[PDB]
């Protein structure tokens, strides 16, 4: 199917506790493959997936140089945006950046993106046409003019529709044994009595990849969005994901409720029902 | 591979 490569950058100022904390991570789909931490002793881009370890020394040299350079510019930008928003040097602030590319099954460019945040809110984003910017406020409009002058969009577009897609293709091939796998959800249902007249039905999906999954409860074949608890999809820590959905049902009405599981790995959607 | 064309905000 379709695949993505995404880089995430976080810079956090820490007044009177040294220069900003910088953490960079690289992902192919839901699999992390590189990290950099400004606080770590290595001061190198580090591998986090087996299949990136087959890149040569020139790869690690360039990635280390370019990730450090990104942290340096983001350090300057924290100072500039603090100026734009008339904020004290005494307060901590956060710049977050995400950029990357999507490809289809054929490995051809699908879309590119770059989004920038300040203190957890949209600051500036490259539009889908990769030619123009959306600035969130009057501070971001100054950045927009600077970025237009320096042809940021033109250079970023060449990266996103070229370099990004080329290296994503390369990573998908080298890591194909793990990246192009689909682990379907192992599914079961549990019954937990609350009182004499109530019980919890919990529908489980375990050990699945990728992360994207839909768990929904129906009563008499009718969607039950209300009286439902749906926890966020969570990592198992072994490269697979877990999720569950729960309904509070009257005692002796368990057979009325069905759980519906949709995942890439499943040939067709699974229907589960309580089995005493 | 990382993008290397760094423009200040």
């Amino acid at each position, epitope marked *: 199917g379709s695949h993505s490569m995404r880089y995430f950058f976080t810079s956090v100022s820490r007044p009177g506790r040294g220069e900003p904390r910088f953490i960079a991570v690289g992902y192919v789909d839901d699999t992390q493959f590189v990290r950099f931490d400004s606080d770590a002793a290595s001061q190198r881009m580090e591998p986090r997936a087996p299949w990136i370890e087959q890149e040569g020394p020139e790869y690690w040299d360039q990635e280390t140089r370019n990730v450090k350079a990104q942290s340096q510019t983001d350090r300057v930008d924290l100072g500039t945006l603090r100026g734009y928003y008339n904020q004290s040097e005494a307060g901590s602030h956060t710049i977050q950046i995400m950029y990357g590319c999507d490809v289809g099954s054929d490995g051809r460019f699908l879309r590119g993106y770059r989004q920038d945040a300040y203190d957890g809110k949209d600051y500036i984003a490259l539009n889908e046409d990769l030619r123009s910017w959306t600035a969130a406020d009057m501070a971001a409009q100054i950045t927009k003019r600077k970025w237009e002058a*320096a042809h940021e969009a033109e250079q970023l577009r060449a990266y996103l529709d070229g370099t990004c897609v080329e290296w994503l293709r390369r990573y998908l091939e080298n890591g194909k044994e793990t990246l192009q796998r689909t682990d379907p959800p192992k599914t079961h249902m549990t019954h937990h009595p609350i009182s004499d007249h109530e019980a919890t039905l919990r529908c489980w999906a375990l050990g699945f990849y990728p992360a994207e999954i839909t768990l929904t409860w129906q009563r008499d074949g009718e969607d039950q969005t209300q009286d439902t608890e749906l926890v966020e999809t969570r990592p198992a820590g072994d490269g697979t994901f877990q999720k569950w959905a729960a309904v509070v049902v009257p005692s002796g009405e368990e057979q009325r409720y069905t759980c519906h599981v949709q995942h890439e790995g499943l040939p067709k959607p699974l229907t589960l029902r309580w089995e005493p | 591979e990382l993008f290397s064309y760094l423009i200040e905000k």
Partner: T-cell receptor, first 114, second 112 residues
């Protein structure tokens, strides 16, 4: 490939008023931009034109420059050359994936004779 | 804007010299270039906001730094005859991907 910038001719002595052609070739086509400088004794380098990888040409007064990235070629045209144009003309590129350092040709030593 | 001191240096082989550069007021980047007769202009090393950003084809006996005030020093040790060149400092308001403003250069002569 290893990026090498070469310029023809190495030197050019011409009478003023002539339209001049200064040639530049580079081995590797993966460049962010190509920049033309003039160098004068004891004054260092002054930028003439900056051509983006996406741009075909740039103009600045009597100066016009073309960029054929695939061919690895750039041409600087000096219209109605004046004695004040006398300098070393330097062709330089910046590599994609690098942090902006210039890779220089050895230059064309231009003498425009009054 | 970009100043370089000293303008001229005459020393013997094996000696050590320090080349000084001050960028344009407010500029963040400092680039060092060596212009010799054999290789022309060659990138040595570049700094951004007081930290090394990139290193060229530079020898171990060649070292440099950018100080908190963003002025830079280039140290050339165990000098050889082949080190005779014009040493240029260039500064940039940003990373230097678009603009590099060159100082007047420091001319070094190494003799027997």
């Amino acid at each position: 490939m290893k990026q090498e910038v070469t310029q023809i001719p190495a030197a050019l002595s011409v009478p003023e008023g002539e339209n001049l052609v200064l040639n530049c070739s580079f081995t590797d086509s993966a460049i962010y931009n190509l920049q033309w400088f003039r160098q004068d004794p004891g004054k260092g380098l002054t930028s003439l034109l900056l051509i983006q990888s996406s741009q075909r040409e740039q103009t600045s007064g009597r100066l016009n420059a073309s960029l054929d990235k695939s061919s690895g070629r750039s041409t600087l045209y000096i219209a109605a050359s004046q004695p004040g144009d006398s300098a070393t003309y330097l062709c330089a590129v910046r590599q994609r994936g690098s942090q902006g350092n210039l890779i220089f040709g050895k230059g064309t030593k231009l003498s425009v004779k009054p | 804007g970009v100043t370089q001191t000293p303008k001229h240096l005459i020393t013997a082989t094996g000696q050590r010299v320090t080349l000084r550069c001050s960028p344009r007021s407010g500029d963040l980047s400092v680039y060092w270039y060596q212009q010799s007769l054999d290789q022309g202009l060659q990138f040595l090393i570049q700094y951004y906001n007081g930290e090394e950003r990139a290193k060229g084809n530079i020898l171990e006996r060649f070292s440099a730094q950018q100080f908190p005030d963003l002025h830079s020093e280039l140290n050339l040790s165990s000098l050889e005859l082949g080190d005779s060149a014009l040493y240029f400092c260039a500064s940039s308001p940003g990373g230097g991907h678009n603009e590099q403003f060159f100082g007047p250069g420091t001319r070094l002569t190494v003799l027997e």
